[PDB]
Amino acid sequence: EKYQVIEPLNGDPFIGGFETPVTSSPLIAWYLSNLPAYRTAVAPLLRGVEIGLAHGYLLVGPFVLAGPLRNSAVRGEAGSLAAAGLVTILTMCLTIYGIASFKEGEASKAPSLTLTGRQKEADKLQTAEGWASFTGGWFFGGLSGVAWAYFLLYVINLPYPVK
Amino acid sequence: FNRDWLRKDLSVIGFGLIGWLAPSSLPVINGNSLTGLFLGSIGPELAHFPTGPALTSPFWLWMITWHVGLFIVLTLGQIGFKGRQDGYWN
Amino acid sequence: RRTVKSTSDSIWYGADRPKYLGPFSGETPSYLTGEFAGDYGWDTAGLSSDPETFARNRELEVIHARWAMLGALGCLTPELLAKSGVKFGEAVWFKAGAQIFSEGGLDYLGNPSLVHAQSILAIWASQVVLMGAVEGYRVAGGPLGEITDPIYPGGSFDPLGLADDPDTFAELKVKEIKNGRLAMFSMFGFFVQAIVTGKGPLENLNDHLADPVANNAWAYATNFVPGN
Amino acid sequence: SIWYGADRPKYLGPFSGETPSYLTGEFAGDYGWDTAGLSSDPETFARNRELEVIHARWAMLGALGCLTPELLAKSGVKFGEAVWFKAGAQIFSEGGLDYLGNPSLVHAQSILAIWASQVVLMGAVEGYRVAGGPLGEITDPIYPGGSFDPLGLADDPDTFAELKVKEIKNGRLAMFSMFGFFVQAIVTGKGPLENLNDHLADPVANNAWAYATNFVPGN
Amino acid sequence: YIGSSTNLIMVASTTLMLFAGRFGLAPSANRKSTAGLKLVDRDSGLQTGDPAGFTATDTLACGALGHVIGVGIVLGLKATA
Amino acid sequence: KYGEKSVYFDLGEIDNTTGNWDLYGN
Amino acid sequence: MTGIAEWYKVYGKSVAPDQDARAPYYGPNRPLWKGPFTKPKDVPEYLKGEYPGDYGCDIFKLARLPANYARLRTQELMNGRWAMLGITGCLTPELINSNSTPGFEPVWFNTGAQIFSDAGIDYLGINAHSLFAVIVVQALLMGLAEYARIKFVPEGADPFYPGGKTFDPLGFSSDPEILAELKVKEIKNGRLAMMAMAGLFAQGAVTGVSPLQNLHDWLHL
Ligand SMILES: CC(/C=C/C=C(C)/C=C/[C@@]12O[C@]1(C)C[C@@H](O)CC2(C)C)=C\C=C\C=C(C)\C=C\C=C(C)\C=C\[C@@]12O[C@]1(C)C[C@@H](O)CC2(C)C
Ligand SMILES: CC1=C[C@H](O)CC(C)(C)[C@H]1/C=C/C(C)=C/C=C/C(C)=C/C=C/C=C(C)/C=C/C=C(C)/C=C/C1=C(C)C[C@H](O)CC1(C)C
Ligand SMILES: CC1=C[C@H](O)CC(C)(C)[C@H]1/C=C/C(C)=C/C=C/C(C)=C/C=C/C=C(C)/C=C/C=C(C)/C=C/C1=C(C)C[C@H](O)CC1(C)C
Ligand SMILES: CC1=C[C@H](O)CC(C)(C)[C@H]1/C=C/C(C)=C/C=C/C(C)=C/C=C/C=C(C)/C=C/C=C(C)/C=C/C1=C(C)C[C@H](O)CC1(C)C
């Protein structure tokens, strides 16, 4: 009869999940709901652009500060090219994943029901053309993010503690 | 999930702040002639130089002690306030 | 995630609102039901039992709070600018009213090209006329519109329209009352510690920061003893 | 009884004719003295009664404690400052607060520690008084009873009411005397019993009228 | 040694603990403490000549705890002063 | 109905029955 | 039934109703002044045990007259109560501070000449040497209390156990049984105070030193 913070998934005890503060806190749930992957109404291309931008931007750093040429004068260029190559490989990964997973002309099988039960429209990211647009946007955004990180770090040479 | 899992009683943090300032800010007659909070304030005073860690200076021990005390005080205050509404001890 | 409808709708109102003694607030006055902003249930003296008196006191409190916020800001900024480097007759608020009796008169940020007033009599007369006009307008009404709520006229006094929604309007009421009460408390500070220390607020703060344990109000505890 | 009821002794004695309606005689220390009309509302009257009783008890404690050091000093007990209105500055002395000139006793030096301890403890007890605490719950804001009635003197209603009246009368006397303490400290600059000795020595010369010509506003 | 500060401290601690246990100010054999630190009455089954219900086991427990506390106070006051 | 009582099986609402929900799909 | 009157953790003889708080100290089966060696030859036929502290010791046959017995009981009670205060007043001064360095005196029997000569009475370390300014006040105050006690019995209160609201404010005597044993406790503690006083008088007369210092010398050495 106590408070009992922990609850079953949407009140259903026979679904394989739980309601924890980590899962569905108002702050955590708000944060996850507004991530580009979970903005179902937005076109897949723009979500892919945002995801690729973020991922290339964060990927530039490790290659630059850990690559084999980190002690040379081409450290920045080598790291940026390594990040771009990883982005390209992941673009091939996304393309083949979409080819294998989705077939042209089929409806989306993503969950179209909210926790409350609003029964919204199915997400178009889980479609052949949706995933193709997502992959193209991710490629463009990844290259853009790598270029932006290289420009900020080296072409413009903003003052940063570690680089 | 009721969206108030951490039942918000904002007086808890202030009560814990008072109840941790009171014992920590005490002129102990022991080897520490002064109080530990003054040491934990001196540490930052000597460590305000930008872009540099303490580097194993006498600042980490006081930081850890003070903040462990603060965290345990806050946790015990939360538990004490929210156990009265329940019947954990009544 | 879920879509939320029932929220913490104006925790500052109702019977479950925070109280002035916190957990030790049991004997809440019956007339203080949390209807109005800033209602912490603090009327130990019972000076607002009569609803008409309670409304009068609310009006007085809001006007005092607004004037106190204005006064605190006007006492604080001049010293901040003086420390920045701006030069004028005097930095402390309680000696800035006598600058008009200096050789250069009253200089606004020490700029003769600005107001550069000379006679205190003219300033006083102009203030009397203008403030009487506006005070009468507030009591009854005037160019900016007749009075609907004497405390919160709104309308022409709400150009930016931050008080559109009633809920955010109540939240802003609470915020305004709290910030104003803090301002009044700090102004009473200013007064008492200017009487005692004889120094400006920010320089008192600086000297406290220099040595907090030794330089505090207790250093002035013996300055008003009657037997010496 | 004599004090409770329509026919009660009034503050003006035989000269009292305008008895306020709200002052009927159902509360202790009801002499019918309300000429400012500051207790007309029942709730305001209850709040004023609570304030009066708390002030009375604090004034009793203050009056006893302001003159106890004086009597002990007259006997010969050594203090730092026996006088009440300089008894608080000895915390700043190098020897600290001796509490009857005994270094083995409290022997406090830091006024900050005294202030913090007082704040915490007084906040706790004040809050208990408002809302209840270890020493019973709150039923009557000013007459709790129980843990604060260990000797059980307030068992039957009659003695309890007579003791109410006696309490409020001694308390009003103490409040008057403490206002006197404050004013005499402000003007004379000497302790209360020292003023008493001066008055007893030369009552005609050493009195309040001797200080009438000290606040003349020459400018 | 009778008038020594150590003797006074130990005697005071033991007497105070015995007084608290005997007069229902501390847990005893017949005075159980709940989770709320409220003292309830229980039948320990030990008969004692004390009208209040102070048993020999209660006396031993109170004396032992009083000695523990008195030793702590004595050594602390010696180390500090 | 899925939420009318303690019943958690409903052929008319199979997505609710099987747990085919979108937790963060704004 | 009143203030610290239900406070039944001080009885002295009763864990439970097994005894009624008055079965011993009264009646035929009570402790006597020679323990089990009181074969009846000195236990008179008027000391049956109705009154507190009755141990059957009337060697000299003083209380053989019932009227005199009541007078003696009252006289015993009064020196008994006064002895209790006196021994407390003779010892507490010398448990708080000591040494007669100032015009103060820690010795009970040397505090009376303190005013008479040199300085006056200085409470704990009210002056000069005026005897007949304490004497008159004490004589006046006692004469009226003394006079108000022998008379002014409200309607039917025992002149030595009034038990009203000014002499029994704490209401220990609400329960008759707890009044029966408290009377025994009073008289027995009073008798102890009286023996202690005779010890102080005799020891002061012989040794001439403060009673506690006599104890310190006896025990330590
Ligand atoms: C009451 C008080 C503090 C109260 C603190 C409270 C309620 C804290 C509450 C909270 O934490 C909780 C519970 C929960 C949180 O969610 C909310 C907050 C709000 C954060 C301090 C008083 C603090 C009071 C102080 C410091 C008083 C100082 C007085 C001085 C210095 C007087 C000086 C003089 O009078 C002399 C001595 C003699 C003359 O000669 C000279 C002058 C100058 C006139
Ligand atoms: C609630 C309650 C309850 C119970 O029942 C009872 C009781 C207790 C009574 C109550 C309480 C109350 C209180 C606390 C109050 C407070 C107040 C204040 C503080 C005010 C201020 C207030 C304040 C204010 C007005 C302010 C104002 C200001 C001003 C004008 C200013 C001016 C100026 C300045 C700028 C400066 C410059 O250089 C100049 C000049 C020109 C000078
Ligand atoms: C009735 C009526 C009626 C109508 O209607 C109107 C009128 C007329 C107005 C009214 C009247 C009124 C009045 C008269 C009032 C008064 C009051 C007072 C006096 C108070 C006090 C009050 C008082 C009080 C509180 C007191 C308190 C005290 C205290 C705290 C103390 C403290 C202290 C001491 C001990 C000393 C030391 O060293 C320190 C200190 C710390 C300092
Ligand atoms: C029973 C019997 C029985 C059979 O039949 C036979 C025989 C055996 C013979 C018998 C016995 C008897 C006896 C033993 C008796 C005793 C008595 C007494 C002891 C009293 C006291 C009695 C006692 C008493 C009163 C007491 C009192 C006291 C007093 C006043 C005090 C005073 C004082 C004091 C405080 C101290 C100061 O500083 C001063 C003075 C002023 C000095």
Contact E14, E63 (CB under 8 A): yes
- The C-alpha atoms of residue D68 and residue D99 are separated, in whole angstroms, by 12
- The C-alpha atoms of residue G87 and residue G92 are separated, in whole angstroms, by 8
Number of H helices, E strands in chain E: 2, 2
Q: Give the burial string for D48-79 (b: 16+ CB within 10 Å, else e).
A: bbbebbbebbebbebbeebbebbebbbeebeb
Amino acid at C128: V
A71 Cβ contact list (under 8 Å, min separation 6): none
Q: What is the rounded (10 degree) CA torsion for D123, D125, D129, D135?
A: 150
D158 Cβ contact list (under 8 Å, min separation 6): D1
Residue C83 DSSP SS3: helix
Angle formed at CA G201 by CA G200 and CA G203, multiple of 5 degrees = 60
- The C-alpha atoms of residue A150 and residue A148 are separated, in whole angstroms, by 5
Report the gap between the CA of B7 and the closest CA in chain E (Å): 22
Distance of CA E56 to the CA centre of its chain: 12
Distance of CA G153 to the CA centre of its chain: 22
Output the CA–CA distances (angstroms, integers) from residue A149 to A92, C219, G60, in the order listed: 22, 57, 120
- The C-alpha atoms of residue G201 and residue G203 are separated, in whole angstroms, by 6
A74 alpha carbon – ligand 3 mean position (Å) = 84
G199 Cβ contact list (under 8 Å, min separation 6): G211
CB atoms within 10 A of CB D16: 14
- The C-alpha atoms of residue G88 and residue B4 are separated, in whole angstroms, by 66
- The C-alpha atoms of residue G46 and residue B34 are separated, in whole angstroms, by 77
- The C-alpha atoms of residue D207 and residue B47 are separated, in whole angstroms, by 64
- The C-alpha atoms of residue C136 and residue C194 are separated, in whole angstroms, by 33
Q: Do C1 and A118 touch (CB under 8 A)?
A: no
In chain B, after which residues does the backbone break, taking C–N over 2.5 angstroms as a break? Answer: none
Touch between A and C (at least 3 CB pairs under 8 Å) = yes
Contact B11, C23 (CB under 8 A): yes
Token pair of C167 as six digits: 């809920």
Output the CA–CA distances (angstroms, integers) from residue G128 to B90, D122, G75, G140, in the order listed: 65, 44, 36, 21
Q: Closest Cα to residue B31, out of E78, E76, E80, D106?
A: E80
Work out whether strand E39-41 and strand E31-33 pair parallel, antiparallel, or are unpaired: antiparallel
Q: Give Dmax over CA atoms of chain C in angstroms.
A: 72
Output the CA–CA distances (angstroms, integers) from residue A34 to A40, A113, A144, B47, in the order listed: 10, 17, 22, 39
Q: Which atom of ligand 2 is nearest to the CA of C44?
A: 5
Find residue E28's DSSP bridge partners: E31
Cβ burial, residue F25 (10 Å; 0-12/13-18/19+): buried
- The C-alpha atoms of residue G4 and residue C100 are separated, in whole angstroms, by 75
Distance of CA D66 to the CA centre of its chain: 10
Judged by a CB distance cut-off of 8 A, whether residue C2 touches chain F is no
- The C-alpha atoms of residue C147 and residue C139 are separated, in whole angstroms, by 8
Contact A76, A64 (CB under 8 A): yes
Contact G80, G218 (CB under 8 A): no
- The C-alpha atoms of residue F25 and residue A108 are separated, in whole angstroms, by 14
Q: Closest Cα to residue A127, out of A148, A147, A98, A84?
A: A98
- The C-alpha atoms of residue C208 and residue C202 are separated, in whole angstroms, by 10
Find residue F22's DSSP bridge partners: A114
Q: Which atom of ligand 4 is nearest to the CA of G90?
A: 36
Contact B27, D113 (CB under 8 A): yes
B42 Cβ contact list (under 8 Å, min separation 6): none
- The C-alpha atoms of residue C20 and residue A92 are separated, in whole angstroms, by 64
- The C-alpha atoms of residue D63 and residue C196 are separated, in whole angstroms, by 28
- The C-alpha atoms of residue E24 and residue G210 are separated, in whole angstroms, by 39
- The C-alpha atoms of residue C181 and residue C189 are separated, in whole angstroms, by 12
Residue appearing with tokens 């600059």? D189
Contact E54, E48 (CB under 8 A): yes
Report the gap between the CA of C3 and the closest CA in chain F (Å): 10
Contact C215, C208 (CB under 8 A): yes
CB atoms within 10 A of CB A102: 19
Token pair of D158 as six digits: 């009659």
Find residue G158's DSSP bridge partners: G161
C78 phi/psi in degrees, rounded to 5: -55, -40
| Phi/psi-derived region of residue C58, left when phi > 0, alpha when psi is between -120 and 50, beta in every other case | alpha
Q: Closest Cα to residue G8, out of G142, G120, G172, G135?
A: G172
Distance of CA E21 to the CA centre of its chain: 6
- The C-alpha atoms of residue D11 and residue D200 are separated, in whole angstroms, by 29
Among positive and negative, which fits the CA dihedral C124, C126, C132, C135? negative
- The C-alpha atoms of residue E26 and residue E18 are separated, in whole angstroms, by 9
Cβ burial, residue C88 (10 Å; 0-12/13-18/19+): middle
Output the CA–CA distances (angstroms, integers) from residue A13 to A19, F6, F9, in the order listed: 10, 11, 12
A76 Cβ contact list (under 8 Å, min separation 6): A64, A150, A153, A154
The closest ligand to the CA of D179 turns out to be 3
- The C-alpha atoms of residue G33 and residue G39 are separated, in whole angstroms, by 11
| C chain contacts of residue D187, beta-carbon cutoff 8 Å | 226
Residues comprising chain C, all counted:
228
Amino acid at A79: G
For residue D138, give the nearest of C26, C29, C218 by CB distance.
Answer: C26
- The C-alpha atoms of residue D75 and residue D82 are separated, in whole angstroms, by 12
Q: Where are the alpha helices (DSSP H) in C88-218?
A: 120-139, 166-197, 201-210
Angle formed at CA B14 by CA B10 and CA B15, multiple of 5 degrees = 105
- The C-alpha atoms of residue G171 and residue G159 are separated, in whole angstroms, by 17
- The C-alpha atoms of residue C107 and residue C105 are separated, in whole angstroms, by 6
C114 alpha carbon – ligand 1 mean position (Å) = 43
Residues comprising chain F, all counted:
26
C201 phi/psi in degrees, rounded to 5: -60, -50
- The C-alpha atoms of residue C116 and residue C88 are separated, in whole angstroms, by 12
Give the N- to C-terminal CA distance of chain A in Å, as an integer: 56
Amino acid at C139: V
Amino acid at C117: A
D131 phi/psi in degrees, rounded to 5: -125, -10
Q: Give Dmax over CA atoms of chain B in angstroms.
A: 52
Among positive and negative, which fits the CA dihedral F14, F18, F24, F25? negative
**DSSP class of A36:** G
Among positive and negative, which fits the CA dihedral G49, G54, G58, G62? negative
- The C-alpha atoms of residue B34 and residue B11 are separated, in whole angstroms, by 30
- A&F contacts, CB < 8 Å: 59
Residue appearing with tokens 């009541």? G70
- The C-alpha atoms of residue A90 and residue A143 are separated, in whole angstroms, by 12
Residue C121 exposure: Cα atoms within 13 Å on the Cβ side: 0
Token pair of C54 as six digits: 């309670």
- The C-alpha atoms of residue C25 and residue E25 are separated, in whole angstroms, by 29
D148 phi/psi in degrees, rounded to 5: -100, 15
Contact D79, D69 (CB under 8 A): yes
Beta carbon of G157 within 6 Å of any ligand 4 atom: no
Q: Closest Cα to residue C46, out of C62, C25, C30, C63?
A: C30
Residue appearing with tokens 């005689």? D25
Contact A123, F25 (CB under 8 A): yes
- B&C contacts, CB < 8 Å: 9
Q: Give the burial string for E34-63 (b: 16+ CB within 10 Å, else e).
A: eeeeeeeeeebeeebebbbbbbeebbebbb
- The C-alpha atoms of residue B72 and residue B16 are separated, in whole angstroms, by 9
**Chains with 3 or more CB pairs closer than 8 angstroms to A?**
B, C, F
Output the CA–CA distances (angstroms, integers) from residue C66 to B68, C34, C55, C184, D109, in the order listed: 42, 22, 17, 9, 43
- The C-alpha atoms of residue A57 and residue A146 are separated, in whole angstroms, by 5
Residue appearing with tokens 């005071």? E12
What is the experimental method? cryo-EM
Contact E51, G12 (CB under 8 A): yes
Amino acid at G160: F
Token pair of C212 as six digits: 């907090």
- The C-alpha atoms of residue C91 and residue C99 are separated, in whole angstroms, by 10
Beta carbon of D59 within 6 Å of any ligand 3 atom: yes
Judged by a CB distance cut-off of 8 A, whether residue C23 touches chain B is yes
- The C-alpha atoms of residue D32 and residue G23 are separated, in whole angstroms, by 57
Q: Closest Cα to residue A23, out of G11, B1, D202?
A: B1
Q: Closest Cα to residue A32, out of F19, F22, C1?
A: C1
Among positive and negative, which fits the CA dihedral C37, C43, C47, C50? positive
Number of H helices, E strands in chain C: 4, 0
Residue D136 DSSP SS3: strand
D99 Cβ contact list (under 8 Å, min separation 6): D105, D106, D107
Q: Where are the alpha helices (DSSP H) in chain A?
A: 21-24, 26-33, 44-66, 75-101, 128-150
Domain boundaries, chain E: 1-81
Residues comprising chain G, all counted:
221
CB atoms within 10 A of CB G57: 16
Beta carbon of D56 within 6 Å of any ligand 3 atom: no
Work out whether strand A18-19 and strand A7-8 pair parallel, antiparallel, or are unpaired: antiparallel
Token pair of D12 as six digits: 């003006």
Distance of CA E38 to the CA centre of its chain: 17
Rg (CA), chain C: 22
- The C-alpha atoms of residue C62 and residue C48 are separated, in whole angstroms, by 15
Output the CA–CA distances (angstroms, integers) from residue C15 to B53, C25, D44, in the order listed: 50, 12, 22
Q: Give the burial string for C185-210 (b: 16+ CB within 10 Å, else e).
A: ebbeebeebbeebeebbbebeeeeee
Cβ burial, residue A9 (10 Å; 0-12/13-18/19+): buried
Residue E32 DSSP SS3: strand
- The C-alpha atoms of residue D45 and residue C49 are separated, in whole angstroms, by 10
Q: Closest Cα to residue D61, out of D172, D192, D196, D174?
A: D174
Distance of CA D32 to the CA centre of its chain: 22
Beta carbon of C221 within 6 Å of any ligand 1 atom: yes
- The C-alpha atoms of residue D38 and residue D44 are separated, in whole angstroms, by 8
Find residue C162's DSSP bridge partners: none
